[PDB]
Amino acid sequence: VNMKAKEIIEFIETFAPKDLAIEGDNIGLQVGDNLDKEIKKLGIALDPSLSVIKKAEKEGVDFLFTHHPLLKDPIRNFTGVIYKKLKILMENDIILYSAHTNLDICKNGLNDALAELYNLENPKPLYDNGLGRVGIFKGSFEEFLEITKKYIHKNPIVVKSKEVDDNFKLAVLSGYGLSQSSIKYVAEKADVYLSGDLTHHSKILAEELGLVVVDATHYSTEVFGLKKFKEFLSSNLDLEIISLDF
Template identity: 35%
Template sequence: MEVTRLIDYLEAYFPLSLQEGWDNSGLQISPQESSIKGVLLSLDVNSQTINEAIKLGCNLIVSHHPLLFSSTKKIFNDFYPYNVLYKAIQKGIGVYAFHTNLDIAEGGLNDYLCNLLELKDIEIIENKRPLRIGRLNRGLDFEVFVDYVKEKLSCDAIKYIKANDRLIKRVAVCSGSCMELVYEILDLDFDVFLSGDLKHHTAIFAKESGINVVDATHYHTEKFSKFILKDIIKRKFRELRVFVSESDYLPWDYR
């Protein structure tokens, strides 16, 4: 099957026009051959991802995070991401990313998280496009909700801010690195904000503003992207060789 046929099919679900202005979703590296031998679905593209693609005989990686974000003036082979770029090109492996368009689209990553958390009455916040707000079946104490998130997202440890004693019923959800939205959502009706990549000063702002926050990490809120893509691909292309990467990882450890 031709690469363009698969990409056109996926873009119908997650149009590039939905991506944020700063994003670089789309084709990162064109494969050496236009015909697909196998597809590897990943969250990130690192050295292990390329090795995995080679081992599985895949010549196309479809990732969530783009390998390249900003304009590039120089390429050196001794640091990331250019070492990965070099190896992918040498091995004829193409890379395509569905990033914020997958976050924003209906049926995409944030809707998946809402379903995983069993939220009801999901609201899409128009001027905060990735953000969803949904309702739990019953109110939970904050500590119980934190444990609930750990279980549903399979997190070993998460950061949180308990800024009030409110019972958790309405949950604001935004995958990845959306914590800066804390400054923009004070007027919305929710009891806790779930995202990743909470920074020090943003945490102080949330605490002082009375906003409960759960930071489930960038990785754990976005690791499901590859399963979304696999499900959609297999609906139409059942015979296509599609693999879910086992090389994605949380890049730090806890003690």
């Protein structure tokens, strides 16, 4: 009737194998010791934030799955916010486990979810490492925008660098894909780039290159696919599953 933590981890890693993760990505077990324990309640979150972790404790979550890792940069002192987070997780024996870029890259992962939403014709990986998707959007720019506003984020920032003809090349990248080097790279591959976390220098670069950029936010472009992932888990596992920051 009940699942062990290691069995949940096994199921997740079958869906999104850890070796799909890009170099250096802190995927896998973040916080935990005994993985033979039976799990009462699974929580899903975009971020292992202090609010999310307090909510997990509040809601009786003992297996906390997040997309973003707890720490990118390693530390050797435990004070302030990280102290408050670890204290809640350790005192309550809550396991924290992450699937980050392996969940972005895998089949039916976060980037596939976007490609399917826009029904990309002949989709291909955007980067060599498997991040992102690119293909033809069979419709007008205005229809593309409507889908974006309806399903992802209502007031996306649009950098309308040039006019966009019907049946354009659409690149999608869930999360933060709007770095300067990404703008330069994707400008060679697509007419329109849908992603998150636009900043000023990247906006200027897109305008110079004629790449239309749509910032539908880091949060919404990932949560769209995370919601799919949650349904997938719910359909397949005999486990109570809740979302914490979406």
